[PDB]
Structure 1
Amino acid sequence: KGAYDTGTYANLFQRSGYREDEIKARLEQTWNDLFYGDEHTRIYYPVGDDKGYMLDTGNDDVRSAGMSYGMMMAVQMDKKHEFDRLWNYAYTYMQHTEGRYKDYFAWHCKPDGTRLSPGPAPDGEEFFAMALFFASNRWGDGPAPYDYQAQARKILHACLHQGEQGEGDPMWEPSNRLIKFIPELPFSDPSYHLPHFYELFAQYANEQDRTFWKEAAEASRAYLRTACHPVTGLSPEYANYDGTPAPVQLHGDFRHFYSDAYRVAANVALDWEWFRKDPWQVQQSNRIQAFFSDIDVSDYRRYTIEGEPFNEPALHPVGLLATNAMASLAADGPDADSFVKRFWNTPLRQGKRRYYDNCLYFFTMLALSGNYRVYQQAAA
């Protein structure tokens, strides 16, 4: 049974020989540096008395994915002040109040809250909902807009039912229960598949949707088995519903193993840790660690999912190392302890491209310390 059933979370750092005091201080220091560090390290910026944003340093914008990541980090670290500031920013500037995207979030804005595009990013919505449910379960609902579980159910209502009552499209395809890349297009992004979050939506969402969420959890586990290469464990950034790489798009070639796809190994490993349902997740984790076992972080490239390297380097090599190390939650092969130590010995990334690397790094620091947990509807 998983950590959801047992309440016991694997501490991979402790299993590797790091001291409990050492591990707690390292996680606290990662939080301090990421949220409140120097101008070359931090990715969180408070705004006035009641707002704050996660900055995509590389693109000079604020992204729904980043805001939702920050909320998950804050609720996992018991940081309600930062949680509330981030949520108020997303609620105030990004959430649509009308039209085809009502209750969805404009996927990016300028730091000052000016929307740059109206379209939403489903990976943002699902993290907002999961972080808000955990906020409700840890702290209790406050007055709107800090009525966390009510806000979460509103987001997930739109995710399944948008355009039943006028203009818009859902973020899940009703026929296959798979999350989409964007509401309008008939293909997916493997990194967006969070079956472990859908298991929990099946407990917390509007009652009429709980069967759908349970089905989505199983459909996403099956989908990832079709999307990850059976030899390398590599997945494409964009994939068809059948798991094969999607066609080249106007805005780029997403057929290869690059930034988005790094999260798949981390998502697979956390579902295994929480729920322990699909033993394939152990083999997927072993395969990707085997692929990268003798590749130094300094040599990380773009790869075809068949494992053929490009000259082109990885944009976010620290992020890739982070996700390869988080796969140690499920891997039982000869590389698992090596990746945990490689990760421990890697500092937070600095400079203009740091944001994505450091979000993945933080989730890995949470998970490998046994601090990436389910906050259940439970007794005092």
Structure 2
Amino acid sequence: KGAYDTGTYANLFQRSGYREDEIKARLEQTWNDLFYGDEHTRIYYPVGDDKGYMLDTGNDDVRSEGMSYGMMMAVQMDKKHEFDRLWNYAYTYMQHTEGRYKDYFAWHCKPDGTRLSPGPAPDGEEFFAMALFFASNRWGDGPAPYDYQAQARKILHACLHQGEQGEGDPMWEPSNRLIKFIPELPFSDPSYHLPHFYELFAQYANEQDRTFWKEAAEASRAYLRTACHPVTGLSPEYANYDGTPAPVQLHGDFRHFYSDAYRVAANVALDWEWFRKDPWQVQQSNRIQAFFSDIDVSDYRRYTIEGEPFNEPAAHPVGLLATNAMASLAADGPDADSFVKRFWNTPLRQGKRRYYDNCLYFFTMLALSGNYRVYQQ
């Protein structure tokens, strides 16, 4: 039985020997540094009395990924003021009110809120929806736009039914119940598959969609079994509906193990912790940890999914270490305990490239301390 059923969350820092007091203080200090820390560390920026944004420091823009991530961190840390500032920014600047992307979020904008491209990123929408559901269950709905439950249901309605509103496209392929890379293209991104959120969407979404969301959960668990390499546990950034690496795209080669794919190990580990439904998840977690067991974080490269290293370094090696450590929620192999310790002894990244590493870092600090939880009712 998973944490969803028992209400009990594994505290791997505690199982590993760290003191309860040290752990809570470490989690609180990670929060403080990321949202209120110095100019070289923080990724959160207040705007006026009622807005705020998560900065992709590397790309000097605001992404629906980072906004939705900041809202999830805020609600897991019971930080309503920051949650509300981030949501208000997303609601005000990013969410489309009309046209083919109505109720979707523009995937990126300038920090001042000027939209840069209208197209959405589905991993944004699914985190917004999950964070808003948790906000409703934790704090209760307020007047619009802080009517969190209805806001979540509106996003997930468009996610399944955009094709019916007019000229747009849904973010899930109805034929196979799989999340797409973008609404228009017939392939996926394995790091976007969050079967554990789809279980909760099957409880909290519009009644007419609950059957679909339950099928989506089972379809996504099956899909990650097809996308992950059976020796190395590595996955491609973009994958076909059959799990094989998708073709090279006009904007680059996403066939290999790089930044997006790091989140797969994290996502499978949290589904195991919450729902304990697919025991392949334990072996997948053991495999990826075995793959990285004897590789220094400063040596992390881009890899083919069969594990052939490129000369090129990982752009986000702290992010990769974080997802590898988060796999300890599921792994029972000889490497779980050492990745937990390696992570504990790793500080937040600083400087221009810090955004992505520090997002993945925080989700791991939450998870390994037993604080990445389902908020029900």
In 2, Cα distance between the equivalents of 1:306 and 1:38?
A: 40
| SS, match of residue 311 in structure 2 | strand
In 2, Cα distance between the equivalents of 1:220 and 1:267?
A: 11
Moved over 2 A (4+): none
In 1, Cα distance between the equivalents of 2:117 and 2:38?
A: 30
In 1, Cα distance between the equivalents of 2:305 and 2:107?
A: 27
Deviations 1:132-151 (A, max 9, x none): 00000000000000000000
In 2, Cα distance between the equivalents of 1:202 and 1:215?
A: 9
1:284 shift after superposition: 0.2
| TM-score, length of structure 2 as denominator length | 1.00
CA RMSD of the aligned region, Å? 0.3
Q: Which stretch shows the higher mean deviation, 24-33 or 158-167?
A: 158-167
In 1, Cα distance between the equivalents of 2:370 and 2:58?
A: 30
Deviations 1:68-109 (A, max 9, x none): 000000000000000000000000000000000000000000
1:166 shift after superposition: 1.1
In 1, Cα distance between the equivalents of 2:171 and 2:358?
A: 27
Map 1:220-231 → 2, pairs under 5 A: 220-231=220-231
In 2, Cα distance between the equivalents of 1:64 and 1:165?
A: 22
1:9 shift after superposition: 0.1
1:40 shift after superposition: 0.3
In 2, Cα distance between the equivalents of 1:182 and 1:286?
A: 31
1:156 shift after superposition: 0.1
| SS, match of residue 169 in structure 2 | coil
- Match of 1:330? 330
In 2, Cα distance between the equivalents of 1:176 and 1:165?
A: 21
1:193 shift after superposition: 0.0
In 1, Cα distance between the equivalents of 2:226 and 2:26?
A: 37
Deviations 1:210-229 (A, max 9, x none): 00000000000000000000
- Match of 1:308? 308
In 2, Cα distance between the equivalents of 1:268 and 1:80?
A: 28
- Match of 1:341? 341
- Match of 1:59? 59
Deviations 1:274-297 (A, max 9, x none): 000000000000000000000010
1:208 shift after superposition: 0.2
In 1, Cα distance between the equivalents of 2:229 and 2:115?
A: 37
| SS, match of residue 163 in structure 2 | coil
In 1, Cα distance between the equivalents of 2:234 and 2:165?
A: 39
| SS, match of residue 339 in structure 1 | helix
Deviations 1:214-260 (A, max 9, x none): 00000000000000000000000000000000000000000000000
In 1, Cα distance between the equivalents of 2:163 and 2:215?
A: 21
Percent identity (aligned):
99
- Match of 2:281? 281
1:262 shift after superposition: 0.1
1:163 shift after superposition: 1.9
Matched, 1:211 2:211: yes
In 1, Cα distance between the equivalents of 2:145 and 2:324?
A: 37
- Match of 2:43? 43
- Match of 1:351? 351
In 2, Cα distance between the equivalents of 1:100 and 1:163?
A: 9
1:187 shift after superposition: 0.1
| SS, match of residue 307 in structure 1 | coil
- Match of 2:95? 95
Map 1:5-84 → 2, pairs under 5 A: 5-84=5-84
In 2, Cα distance between the equivalents of 1:262 and 1:171?
A: 22
Deviations 1:340-366 (A, max 9, x none): 000000000000000000000000000
In 1, Cα distance between the equivalents of 2:37 and 2:16?
A: 28
1:34 shift after superposition: 0.2
1:111 shift after superposition: 0.1
Q: What stretches of structure 2 of length at least 5 have no aligned partner?
A: none
1:165 shift after superposition: 2.6
Deviations 1:323-344 (A, max 9, x none): 0000000000000000000000
Map 1:99-248 → 2, pairs under 5 A: 99-248=99-248
In 2, Cα distance between the equivalents of 1:230 and 1:215?
A: 24
| SS, match of residue 53 in structure 1 | strand
| SS, match of residue 240 in structure 2 | coil
In 1, Cα distance between the equivalents of 2:165 and 2:197?
A: 26
1:130 shift after superposition: 0.0
| SS, match of residue 261 in structure 2 | helix
1:24 shift after superposition: 0.2
Q: What stretches of structure 1 of length at least 5 have no aligned partner?
A: none
In 2, Cα distance between the equivalents of 1:49 and 1:164?
A: 38
In 1, Cα distance between the equivalents of 2:69 and 2:230?
A: 29
In 1, Cα distance between the equivalents of 2:80 and 2:33?
A: 18
Deviations 1:288-326 (A, max 9, x none): 000000001010000000000000000000000000000
Deviations 1:26-46 (A, max 9, x none): 000000000000000000000
In 1, Cα distance between the equivalents of 2:35 and 2:280?
A: 36
